[PDB]
Amino acid sequence: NTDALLENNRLYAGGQATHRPGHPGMQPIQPSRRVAVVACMDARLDVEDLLGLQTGEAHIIRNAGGVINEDAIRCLIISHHLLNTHEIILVHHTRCGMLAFTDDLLRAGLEGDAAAEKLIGQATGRAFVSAGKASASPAAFQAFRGPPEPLDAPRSDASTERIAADVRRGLSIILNHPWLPTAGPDAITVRGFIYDVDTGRLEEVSYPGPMG
Amino acid sequence: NTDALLENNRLYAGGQATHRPGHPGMQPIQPSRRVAVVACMDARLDVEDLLGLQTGEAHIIRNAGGVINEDAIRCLIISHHLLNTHEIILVHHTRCGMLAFTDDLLRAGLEGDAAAEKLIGQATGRAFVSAGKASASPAAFQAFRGPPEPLDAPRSDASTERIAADVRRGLSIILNHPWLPTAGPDAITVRGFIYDVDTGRLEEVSYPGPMG
Amino acid sequence: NTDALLENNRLYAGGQATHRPGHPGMQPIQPSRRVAVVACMDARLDVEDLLGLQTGEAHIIRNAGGVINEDAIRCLIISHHLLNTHEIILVHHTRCGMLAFTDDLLRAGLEGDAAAEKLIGQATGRAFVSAGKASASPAAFQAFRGPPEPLDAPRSDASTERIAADVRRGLSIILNHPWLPTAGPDAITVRGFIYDVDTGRLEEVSYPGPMG
Amino acid sequence: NTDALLENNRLYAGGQATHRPGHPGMQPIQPSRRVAVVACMDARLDVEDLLGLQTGEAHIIRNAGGVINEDAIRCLIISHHLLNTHEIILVHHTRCGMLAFTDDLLRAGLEGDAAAEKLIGQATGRAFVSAGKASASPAAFQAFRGPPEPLDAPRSDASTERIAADVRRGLSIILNHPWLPTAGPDAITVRGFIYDVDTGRLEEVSYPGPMG
Ligand code: NA
Ligand code: NA
Ligand SMILES: [Zn+2]
Ligand SMILES: [Zn+2]
Ligand SMILES: [Zn+2]
Ligand SMILES: [Zn+2]
């Protein structure tokens, strides 16, 4: 399925759309392409559009970063074991917000550290206001490994490898989770990509490789 | 923003699309409509299409059920505090898979209970195969409260209220989480809906109301 | 180490204590017996006392039920990989509160369902008062599989097997988690028990076996 | 209850024990002192001993660091709402392992980064061996804020304030969690302490104050 989606993405990058934006009528719950995609929530990604998926073809799982965390695994388990998908595509992307902050800064700002509160405003260009209380949850914001770059910075080699390392960790999480079959007759297959938000083109991430 | 999106959805339901499926070119990370949408991963939902959002306008957060769990809160915190959104829309939907199983059945099937394994096959119409091992994570599959109905069953009053109760719980989670400002000068506003996958039309969920 | 602790427990059950309750003076952080124990928080368990451990000998990890959940795994990973333990003992126990409620009842009572609120009072014999709001966390209360029995009910065959099944699931979680080595030259070994709070005696749980 | 426990701790520090280490016979599940204690799993802490609690008097919740995380909240909710406790004591302690590593180092070592693997061996003085795979869980190891000190280093002002800040964050988590009543007629009260493992004496942490 997926090389065909990469060709749809080549068209998309070149200025030709493939997704049909109208309502498809009544459909069954099982994704017809037997695919699940995990992508960032970033507004610049329309996952169906950039892959040329049609409505009804794939599960679309999206969170901050497109990270493979506990919820992503919950989703993938349901997708495969209950709803019959057997392929997974990861779509991280360039200029991702998860490159631009650290867990501890945001935590401290929310808790009420005045320095962290000020620093987050400086990093974001908005008037961040502390909650002034601590929380146990969420336990982790899952910012990408590495020191932060400016928010929405243009691409670079260094940031591409930081994004790619996060993709590789997600591939390893899926390929070693006890409740996802990625070998034998019920197996799932998985590939990971980085979407360039400015060009519209996907590039594939190597696996195995370094993971953060 | 949102009543305009409901009008786009009225068009969508009636057979007229509003989302433009081509690449929009270079854009900034901040969602231009300052909106975050949390929806189910169900393949029959194209969130941008059914709301008439354009690429670049909204964060799109999607998981099994569109539930407000720890990851959804992680996403919303980033969306608002770092990326300046201030409105949230919840889109649960009809014929959702989260109406059709229970946490304990799926857990036991994955663990290797032969009865549960067989029962999940009967419920799903696929050859479910146990992992044969236990896992601590995910801690909860977050199936909707109430006894399970058949997978992909047509709408009913009872199931509409089960979906609506889950939407109300998600609204309450957001409106009482320590790290989401939903009052005062940094506040976020939130509304919840059920998307009818067969008609293409949204219906709004009342709040406050019963929560499961 | 552990058969010696079982002999200390035989003494304890018979009315002879082995733990020394005074301060042992300065000690190193590494547990001297290279053991970690995971037990219920139940007030009737003094883990050091019932095993005849001395202060400084073992990590003592305790939560509601003694369940192997994400935090228990966090603890065990630190215990072994950083602090050199290589044996794990699970101590579930009789008359455990985790036999007496269900996740959904407590959730609904906390959310504000008036029926659930009343029912929890009836089950607990205390004036339970709803919080009147929903929360994403904790995602699961981890009550033992099976229908609830009365709070603090005396032992039975049925409840012993419900406790034992939870112990077996915890053993399977540990023995299949990606980040706990339970084979090869860095391996950890693990055994599981039920502590009888009334007699003071441990009984060992079979493994492999049914897991809930 | 708690000032009496502090006097028992003064005796303990001075070389006089108060906890009785034998089996107390049959007891009810409700902690008789209506207290829950959250402490580190560190082997040098025997919580009942250092507070002079008797078996049956208090819930004893223990994890790496004594941190207030999602599981600690799960435990406290059960403790109060089902089992009638209404006081909480936090016991962090000196020379805690959570002062000596960072989440990202341990994650990377477990994932298989050879540099991180080597560095963890150097920090711990043991032969740390990578798992060679990624995991989504545990999402956070919850090392204390601040740069790492040597494992099991002697006390200092700087490390005392790092421990105290973690205690204050835990107090704030409890005092702002939606499902713990810490005001009104069902309220819980809470105090936080640092246990000196070398002297045996507790010292109380100020609240409100800085939180990491
Ligand atoms: Na779309
Ligand atoms: Na003890
Ligand atoms: Zn992103
Ligand atoms: Zn759904
Ligand atoms: Zn128990
Ligand atoms: Zn410690």
- CA–CA separation, B46 and A52 (whole Å): 12
Q: Give residue for tokens 């080597």.
A: D118
- CA–CA separation, B65 and B91 (whole Å): 9
Question: Does residue C51 contact residue C9 with C-beta atoms inside 8 Å?
Answer: yes
Cβ count within 10 A of residue C55: 24
Structural tokens at position C119: 């029912």
Question: Does residue D55 contact residue D24 with C-beta atoms inside 8 Å?
Answer: yes
What DSSP assignment string belongs to A126-151? S------S--S-SS---PPSS----T
CATH number of the D1-212 domain: 3.40.1050.10
Using alpha carbons only, give the angle D62, D65, D68 rounded to the nearest 5 degrees.
Answer: 70
Restricting to D residues 124-143, those with a Cβ less than 8 Å away from any Cβ of A are 133-137, 139-140, 142
- CA–CA separation, A178 and C177 (whole Å): 7
What DSSP assignment string belongs to C67-78? ---HHHHHHHHI
Task: Indicate the residue type of D177.
Answer: H
Which residues from A are below 8 Å from D166, CB to CB?
none
What DSSP assignment string belongs to B36-104? EEEEE--TT--HHHHHTPPTTSEEEEEETT----HHHHHHHHIIIIIT---EEEEEEETT-GGGS--HH
Maximum alpha-carbon separation in chain A: 55
Q: Which residues are paired to D95 by β-bridges?
A: none
Question: Using CB atoms, which residue from B73, B136, B140 is nearest to C173?
Answer: B136
D84 close to A (CB below 8 A): no
Q: What is the CA radius of gyration of chain C?
A: 18
Show me where the domains of chain B are located: 1-212
Contacts of C150 (CB under 8 A, 6+ apart): C100, C123
Indicate yes or no: CB of C136 within 8 angstroms of CB of A136: no
Structural tokens at position A141: 């914001």
- CA–CA separation, B166 and A47 (whole Å): 26
Rounded distance from Cα B108 to ligand 3 centre (Å): 35
Structural tokens at position B173: 């989670």
Contacts of B109 (CB under 8 A, 6+ apart): A81, B116, B117, B119, B120, B128, B130
C77 close to B (CB below 8 A): no
Q: Regarding beta strands A87-93 and A58-63, do their DSSP bridges make them parallel or antiparallel, or are they unpaired? A: unpaired
Q: Regarding beta strands C35-40 and C87-93, do their DSSP bridges make them parallel or antiparallel, or are they unpaired? A: parallel
What DSSP assignment string belongs to C68-132? --HHHHHHHHIIIIIT---EEEEEEETT-GGGS--HHHHHHHHHT-HHHHHHHHHHHSS------
Task: Indicate the residue type of B70.
Answer: E
Question: Does residue D96 contact residue D163 with C-beta atoms inside 8 Å?
Answer: yes
Distance from the first to the final alpha carbon of chain B: 29
Contacts of D52 (CB under 8 A, 6+ apart): D4, D5, D7, D8, D9, D11, D12, D17, D18, D19
**Residue pairs spanning A and D at CB distance below 8 A:** 78
Show me where chain A is broken: residue before each gap, C-N > 2.5 A.
none
Helix (H) / strand (E) element for C191: namely strand C189-195
- CA–CA separation, C94 and C153 (whole Å): 9
Contacts of B150 (CB under 8 A, 6+ apart): B100, B123
Determined by X-ray
Task: Indicate the residue type of D34.
Answer: R
Maximum alpha-carbon separation in chain D: 55
CA atoms within 13 A on the CB side of D154: 2
Please give the order of strands across the beta sheet that includes C202-204.
Answer: C202-204, C189-195, C87-93, C35-40, C58-63, D58-63, D35-40, D87-93, D189-195, D202-204
Give the burial class of B12: count Cβ atoms within 10 A of its Cβ; 0-12 exposed, 13-18 middle, 19 or more buried.
buried
Q: What is the CA radius of gyration of chain A?
A: 18
- CA–CA separation, C160 and C121 (whole Å): 25
Rounded distance from Cα C148 to ligand 5 centre (Å): 14
D96 is known to lie in a ligand binding site:
yes
Cβ count within 10 A of residue A211: 23
Using alpha carbons only, give the angle D77, D79, D82 rounded to the nearest 5 degrees.
Answer: 85
For residue A2, the SS3 value is helix
Task: Give the burial string for A168-181 (b: 16+ CB within 10 Å, else e).
Answer: bbbbbbbbbbbbbb
Structural tokens at position D142: 């919850």
- CA–CA separation, A79 and C180 (whole Å): 27
Q: Give residue for tokens 């219920």.
A: C40
Q: Is the peptide bond before A208 cis (omega within 30 degrees of 0)?
A: yes
Q: Regarding beta strands D58-63 and D87-93, do their DSSP bridges make them parallel or antiparallel, or are they unpaired? A: unpaired
Q: Regarding beta strands C202-204 and C189-195, do their DSSP bridges make them parallel or antiparallel, or are they unpaired? A: antiparallel
Output DSSP code: residue B4: H
Give the burial class of C171: count Cβ atoms within 10 A of its Cβ; 0-12 exposed, 13-18 middle, 19 or more buried.
buried
Question: Does residue A120 contact residue B82 with C-beta atoms inside 8 Å?
Answer: yes
Measured CA distances, C78 to A70, B17, B126, D124, D145 (Å): 20, 54, 40, 11, 17
Residue C14 backbone phi and psi in degrees, to 5: -80, 0
Cβ count within 10 A of residue D30: 21
Rounded distance from Cα C67 to ligand 5 centre (Å): 9
Residue D140 backbone phi and psi in degrees, to 5: -150, 140
Length of chain A: 212
Residue B179 backbone phi and psi in degrees, to 5: -110, 10
Rounded distance from Cα B36 to ligand 3 centre (Å): 14
Structural tokens at position D51: 């507070």
Indicate yes or no: CB of D106 within 8 angstroms of CB of C36: no
A75 is known to lie in a ligand binding site:
no
Structural tokens at position A21: 């934006």
Task: Give the burial string for A72-95 (b: 16+ CB within 10 Å, else e).
Answer: bbbbbbbbbbbbbbbbbbbbbbbb
Contacts of C19 (CB under 8 A, 6+ apart): C46, C48, C49, C52, C53, C54, D21, D46
Question: Does residue B125 contact residue B151 with C-beta atoms inside 8 Å?
Answer: yes
- CA–CA separation, C39 and C57 (whole Å): 16
Indicate yes or no: CB of C22 within 8 angstroms of CB of D17: yes
- CA–CA separation, B55 and D102 (whole Å): 38
For residue C177, the SS3 value is coil
C122 close to A (CB below 8 A): no
What DSSP assignment string belongs to chain D? -HHHHHHHHHHHHTT------S---S--SS-TT-EEEEEE--TT--HHHHHTPPTTSEEEEEETT----HHHHHHHHIIIIIT---EEEEEEETT-GGGS--HHHHHHHHHT-HHHHHHHHHHHSS------S--S-SS---PPSS----TTPPP-HHHHHHHHHHHHHHHHHHHH-TTS--SSTT--EEEEEEE-TTT--EEEPPSS----
Contacts of B6 (CB under 8 A, 6+ apart): B202
- CA–CA separation, B85 and A82 (whole Å): 34
Which residues from A are below 8 Å from D104, CB to CB?
145, 212
For residue B210, the SS3 value is coil
